Amino acid sequence: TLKQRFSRGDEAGTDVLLKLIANGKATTEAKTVANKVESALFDFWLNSRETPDKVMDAFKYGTTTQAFLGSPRWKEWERYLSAYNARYPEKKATAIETLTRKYGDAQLLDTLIGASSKGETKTLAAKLQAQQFDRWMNLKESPLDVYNRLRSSYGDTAFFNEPQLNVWVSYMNVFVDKNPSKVDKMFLELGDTFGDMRLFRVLGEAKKFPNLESTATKLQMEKASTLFASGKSPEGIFKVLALDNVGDDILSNTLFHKWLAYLQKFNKEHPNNQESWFDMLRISYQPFGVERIIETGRKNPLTRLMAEKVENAYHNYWLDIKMEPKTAFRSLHLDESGEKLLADPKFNTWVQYLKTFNDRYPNEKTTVIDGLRDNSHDIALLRMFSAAKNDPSTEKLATDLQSALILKWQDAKKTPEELKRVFVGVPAADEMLDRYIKLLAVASSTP
Amino acid sequence: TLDEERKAPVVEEDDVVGFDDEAKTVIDRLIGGSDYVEVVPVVGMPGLGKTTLAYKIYKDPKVEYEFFTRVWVYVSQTFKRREIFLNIISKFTRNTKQYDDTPEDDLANEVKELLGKGGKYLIVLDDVWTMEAWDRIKIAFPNNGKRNRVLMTTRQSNVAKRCNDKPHDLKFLTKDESWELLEKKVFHKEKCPPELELPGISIAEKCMGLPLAIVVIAGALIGKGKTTREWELVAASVGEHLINRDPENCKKLVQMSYDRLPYDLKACFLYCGAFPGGSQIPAKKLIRLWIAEGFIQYQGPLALEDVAEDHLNDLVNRNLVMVTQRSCSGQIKTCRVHDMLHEFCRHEAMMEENLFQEIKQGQERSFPGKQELATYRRLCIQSLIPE
Amino acid sequence: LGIQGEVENLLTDLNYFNAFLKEAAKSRRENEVLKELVKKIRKVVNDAEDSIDKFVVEAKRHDHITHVARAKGVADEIKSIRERVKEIRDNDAYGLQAITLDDEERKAPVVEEDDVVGFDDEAKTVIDRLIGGSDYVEVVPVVGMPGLGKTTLAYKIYKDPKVEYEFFTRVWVYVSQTFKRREIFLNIISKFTRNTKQYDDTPEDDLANEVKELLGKGGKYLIVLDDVWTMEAWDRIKIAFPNNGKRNRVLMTTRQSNVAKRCNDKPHDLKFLTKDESWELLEKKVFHKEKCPPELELPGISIAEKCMGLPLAIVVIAGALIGKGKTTREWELVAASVGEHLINRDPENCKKLVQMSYDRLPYDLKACFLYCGAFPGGSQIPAKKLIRLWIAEGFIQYQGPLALEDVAEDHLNDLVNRNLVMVTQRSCSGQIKTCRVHDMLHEFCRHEAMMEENLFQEIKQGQERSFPGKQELATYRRLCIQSLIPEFLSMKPSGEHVRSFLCVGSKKIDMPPNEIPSIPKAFPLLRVLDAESIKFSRFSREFFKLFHLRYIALSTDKIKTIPADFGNLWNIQTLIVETQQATLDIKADIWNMTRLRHVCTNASATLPSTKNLVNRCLQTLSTIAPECCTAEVFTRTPNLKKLGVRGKIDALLESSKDGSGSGLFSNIGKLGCLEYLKLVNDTRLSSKPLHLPPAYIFPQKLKKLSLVDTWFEWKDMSILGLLPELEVLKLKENAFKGQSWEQEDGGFPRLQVLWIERTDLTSWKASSGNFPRLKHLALISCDKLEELPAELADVKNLQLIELQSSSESAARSARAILKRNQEKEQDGDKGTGFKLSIFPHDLGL
Amino acid sequence: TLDDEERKAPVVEEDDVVGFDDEAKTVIDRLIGGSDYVEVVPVVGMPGLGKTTLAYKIYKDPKVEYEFFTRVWVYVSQTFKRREIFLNIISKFTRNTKQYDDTPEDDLANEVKELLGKGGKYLIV
Ligand SMILES: Nc1ncnc2c1ncn2[C@@H]1O[C@H](COP(=O)(O)OP(=O)(O)OP(=O)(O)O)[C@@H](O)[C@H]1O
Ligand SMILES: Nc1ncnc2c1ncn2[C@@H]1O[C@H](COP(=O)(O)OP(=O)(O)OP(=O)(O)O)[C@@H](O)[C@H]1O
Ligand SMILES: Nc1ncnc2c1ncn2[C@@H]1O[C@H](COP(=O)(O)OP(=O)(O)OP(=O)(O)O)[C@@H](O)[C@H]1O
């Protein structure tokens, strides 16, 4: 009766009924009859023996699959599925197997991967992804067989790129978990059907899974030893060793230390053809990845010193490409430090960088006040210097920069009338404005 | 019988042609004035260059130094006051999830606190369409007596007047500025070869100084090439390239004002396209034609002349119709529709609505046949009437 | 009486159905029931416009017993169409529901990183362009046809050691057919910081400002805007790219040349794989590391050539060869049916990529592009023949001020700018002269226009596809036959719905005399007859009954006169009679052809008597007799843009000694729209050679001139310099007589191309004022010229002078000009890019 | 038959309120007096009379801002959510909204009771 009344046909589901059920359950004043209607809807579907695929289409229509998993509507679909399975034993289906019958497991794999990225759906995707590996284990699929079957739609190289690499290696954990005696020969066929680099990429991700750490490290180190003896350039071996995707923790990585010792050995054997260790990290991870490398490394006390080495080479790389100090002010993230910047240790390193930039490039030499004025408003400088002169330290820097701003004011012929109207309604501005008026009068009074 | 994307405009940052003195004029009006929050509206017809001038002022070295806090807000035909206040709040604090259940009333007071912490503030309310929108948004802007400014851009003179009794009507580019803009757009840094200067200059002059038309036309010139014959084809069909060939830049921008027209004012605006492009339309003649056509439906106390007159004054306020001469008493005397808007009136009325049809035999086209005249409802003709 | 009213009822239904097809073609949904509905409605629409056109010509002919019977037959046919229309609405009501109502894909494409073959040189070219350049943000757009390898090259460029080393930060952005600008900025931000959750209330304007700040933290950035489709899409994304004067670069890949030109006026058109590289890719994709077996090597290279150096076709056939096994017989079978494996049997990879450009095409350009697939694969399509065919079919609808030829030429330019049609030849002025569609697009055109839209059907006698029967011809819309025309026509075919008959063959064939009237008898509703590859010995009364004919082209060696009954075809626009006879006499009433646009012939056409009415649509008269260039004929044709004169032209240039100045050449000057003029001489026995009439008699708006055998003295070339708008001048042998060539000061104010062939020139003196805009100057077989004037080296606009087997002095002068120009360039003078070509290298090197 | 948003809170003159000085003082002095319990002072009139303008004049009046430590503006209307009103009032005092995602409406009203009670004498518009 409610279908005919609330639909004209061609509804393509029962959304008009379900949206009102949610509306009634949104308040306790109508929840009592709202649940009575909802239980009638589930009973109606069961009595008509509706396909759970069709019922999922009813819950899913009007929203993306990612949001559907994140809505309570998914829980209602599971409640329908349990009722459908219990009431009709003649044919049953699991949550993941019904899902596979609608979306092919290739289209399902990145759907569960996407639900893993969304932290709200991470828990649900965890139970669905495990069952998907269960149905692949049932069909007795090897990890290579899963790769080959899915490669027809994913692409040849997709499974060696994140986040597909993590989910594919994660299934290698569940495969070895039930089959502990064939892990060693699994990596042999991986190294035979793919190159050395493609083996290293899978091997590095395997070290993150406890059930595969022992075998992954055993293969990775032995394969690395036979490659360091080849004498190839360390630049080439760096990419082959899959060191270009380790992550922010590359400084604590054990393989990366093996390459560093090899690169030092190579460098001293070829003093006229020296290669740098920084430009490989800079190329592979990009400068923003180098910054993340420095901060994550410095967080660990066991590699603090080596985190200082990459920071020094990173700031040296700045001078090689000739980045102006006014831009390193932004690069060091001094723009988001707020006010009272003179006590920030990053300010000291920025000034040190400015000293080295002017010394190395004596054409475009700019002092500290030039860098600050090019990035921050004069009003913010008045706030910053007034909040720095009252400290037991940095008074000399504050006073010198205040004088520098005073001279910088008269360079552009800034009459006190314009400064008064610009600095209207802000404190700590009249004190320096009075000093500016007295300095302007003194300068004009000199014969 | 039974039953939306926010796209803020993008304008030139470098090489803005002909706005050096308009920016200087408006900046002077922003710097000087009373101690209260003053609105400086920039008014103009669609595609005149209001947002380009506003962004030129917004990034001007003098304006940036003058106003410590500068906020660019994109108002439009449709907007939500809650997201407007949260967008402005996001300029200052990064934790915008802090205000999930905070009402819009306390959101506006939050913006009051953020803006008043320093000196002056300049707030560019881009694309304001109604006085209600300005009234609802201006809560967030405090009147703390700090010479604060609100730069505004709008197609509506009535909205501009209510914000300031002397709105800043934006200029049209001159003949040399139209040619300079088109030359830069097509040939980039290089100069125009002399073989293309003669038809190219005619192209820029037929755009009637409207920067939007010059930018749209330069897109067609870039694609076609750099031969003389192609540019004379464009020069002979400047209007068609603007509207018919480009239904995404010129047609959609004009439709933003045409679709917001009342249903009765739409036929009145399209009727102005029956007159020749660039020709002066006497306001008394246009009004008498509207009443005689039946467009003016009215049964109140006023006379139909006074009701059709404020229909025309509504079009002028919307900047869909320009005024060239005003009577001694201030009444509109002579009015003229811009060339690209006139092409929109021609394309819409002849093709989309069948309001009127041109009768001509030009180079290749001839007078309509018996099959076409049987479907014609209005005939407008300039020459060759006896034949 | 009421039959015409019933035509209005059918026409009202046709407007609804045509809008239904137009709306359905805007969204290729997966609904198969709608796919069969659009095919059924389209067939009814096609059968309806045919019946309406039959009614139109019947009414025109009437304004008698045979006419009454034909009127009754038309009424019965209209009634059948009306009853078929009612069945559509009665049974397919749901199908109309789905279209009058309204209502994952952003995954970046996969391209191979390793085993990239043939892009080492192209990558180096683009890299050298990215490293160099100016100090502001420059875009380097790589542009090419679908499947060319733009993304493969872009990813190769994105990963070289030189690109990675030089640029501070490199970002890959996948723009697509449809994209959200908010997602693009959040993806760039996601690479710098992972906390993209914090921008939920941040507008796109502040997102672009954040991308500005992130990219501006360091030095150069290279941003690979992949698959940009629109001018607007680049403008909306470039606002996130800062301009801090650090040689920042953007590498754009696109199928659109017009989008590429806006970003940079010098787009990098990607190259096609050679025959060696095409085979290298095929053997690397099918056999992987193992080499090709010797027995399969011969068929393998054959299929590699079938791809025409396109990597996408090579990848597609690679899957076909893997599935079909590895046998010699199967591989040779594939080589005979390469097109089937590309589109018909592999819609998963190749067809979708082609359809991305096709479904974006405007509705008018879709039929224009599919029509380009009628011509044989790899054949060269003349641009003027293609344009006139589009107009004749009705694909070009226009009401503005331009001519239909200029609008259709703009359609051809749009297809070329979309990389859907190649350009092989260009005229002197740069206008497209000859175009060719790529192989993969030709098979897609044939699949779409035969099995989906029924635009045209080909006739051939293959292994299993013999000549179609009566049932198949009852559904064929357009006929495209290449060979065996008399054999096909001998069976007396009966196609009552055929609207076009394109003889797309290259070699001319003589039609047997007994089968001449078979074309008009078979298809009474013929609208286009492209029989220029068929020689006709005689005209037939059946030809004069094709009242719907609009494009007619035919060759002949015997017919001297076009009969008067030819004028009964009042619908004709293009009239081409390529005859080998000396003269052609058009007795047809061509003036009654109100829509006549072109009359082309190789003989001296003798126009009929004009005896108010004006032929406003006539653009070309081509070669006509001098005596027919009267002021009365030119009165009836005001819009003529090309004129040709052939024969005894001394009747044109002779002075009217009776006392007036009404020489026949003076009438030509009254044509204001003339742009190109041709004169060809036949009679040489005049007592004195002809001399040019004064320049003010010439049409002032003339921009191209061509003379043949006119024997004009070199002294009367300076008067041609008084033509204000002349841009191209070309002369064949004996057009100018004499050995001394001298020029006055000034003149030729706008000349751009000059062409001379086999003249008696030996001495040449000129001045710098005669070449202010000259670009091309060829002197084919003018080996008697001694030396080029030194003033030519001062012409900045000069581009190329080509001579073969010239004199030793001419070669020495060319060497001196080249050496002095190179020395001047070494001294700071700006180079004009002047080149000299000598073929073969045995002489001159 | 088969028929079924944004909170458009009215906007009023913050300045240049013409002729409401006597009306504001009359209602303000009425707010001061009365019983110690909860007492309502309803301002009633025809549409567009200035009820919200006078209410905002009293709401920001210096006498009211000094007398009443807690002042709350609630935009009730024809249609409203009883839950969102209590969340709106709570957002005045504590900014943590995530902890009330599942709290029942009556328990939210209980929390509003504690917030207003500790704030001393309060006025609610
Ligand atoms: N002085 C100028 N120099 C170069 N380009 C300009 C100039 N003025 C405007 N334009 C261009 O013209 C187009 C329209 O200008 P603009 O965006 O300022 O329009 P508008 O007047 O704000 O439009 P709307 O009527 O939608 O509010 C834009 O593409 C802009 O880049
Ligand atoms: N040089 C090459 N060597 C090997 N394979 C190639 C080469 N160039 C292209 N390919 C392959 O050709 C196919 C299509 O090429 P690609 O994806 O680069 O097309 P595209 O030009 O980007 O096309 P679209 O116009 O659809 O964007 C891919 O599978 C790619 O791997
Ligand atoms: N004293 C006043 N001085 C100036 N403007 C006033 C005054 N009183 C009201 N207004 C204006 O009158 C309009 C309507 O007044 P108000 O918003 O107070 O309505 P109201 O009486 O609360 O009606 P409603 O029942 O519709 O909410 C507003 O635009 C407001 O600015």
Numbering used by the authors:
A (entry chain G): 232 to 678
B (entry chain B): 133 to 135, 143 to 526
C (entry chain A): 25 to 87, 97 to 136, 143 to 650, 658 to 891
D (entry chain C): 133 to 136, 143 to 263
Q: What does the literature reporting this entry say, word for word?
A:
Helper NLRs function as central nodes in plant immune networks. Upon activation, they oligomerize into inflammasome-like resistosomes to initiate immune signaling, yet the dynamics of resistosome assembly remain poorly understood. Here, we show that the virulence effector AVRcap1b from the Irish potato famine pathogen *Phytophthora infestans* suppresses immune activation by directly engaging oligomerization intermediates of the tomato helper NLR SlNRC3. Cryo-EM structures of SlNRC3 in AVRcap1b-bound and unbound states reveal that AVRcap1b bridges multiple protomers, stabilizing a stalled intermediate and preventing formation of a functional resistosome.
We captured the effector AVRcap1b from the Irish potato famine pathogen *P. infestans* in complex with stalled three-protomer intermediate of the tomato helper NLR SlNRC3. AVRcap1b interacts with all three SlNRC3 protomers on the interface that, in a fully formed resistosome, would normally be masked by the second half of the hexamer. The effector wraps around the bottom of the three protomers making contact with the underside of the assembled NLRs. The WY1 domain of AVRcap1b, known to contribute to the NbTOL9a binding, was not resolved in our structure suggesting flexibility of this domain that may be important for NbTOL9a engagement. The remaining LWY domains (LWY2-7) collectively form the interface between AVRcap1b and the three SlNRC3 protomers **([Fig fig3])**. Among the LWY domains, LWY6 contributes to the most extensive interaction interface, with a buried surface area of 729 Å^2^, through multiple hydrogen bonds and hydrophobic interactions. Phe207, which plays a crucial role in the LWY6 interaction with protomer-3, also contributes significant buried surface area to the LWY7 interface with protomer-2. Together, LWY6 and LWY7 account for 61% (1274 Å^2^ out of a total of 2088 Å^2^) of the total buried surface area between AVRcap1b and the three SlNRC3 protomers, underscoring their key role in effector binding. Structural analysis of the SlNRC3-AVRcap1b complex revealed that SlNRC3 Tyr204, Glu205, Phe206, and Phe207 (hereafter, the YEFF motif) are simultaneously engaged by LWY6 and LWY7 of AVRcap1b. However, in the presence of AVRcap1b, SlNRC3^Y204A/E205A^ didn’t associate with AVRcap1b in an intermediate band (presumably the 3:1 SlNRC3: AVRcap1b complex) as clearly observed with SlNRC3 (**[Fig fig5]**). These results independently confirm that the Y204A/E205A substitutions disrupt AVRcap1b binding without compromising SlNRC3 resistosome assembly and provides further support for a model in which the effector targets a conserved NB-domain interface to stall resistosome assembly of a helper NLR at a sub-hexameric state (**[Fig fig5]**).
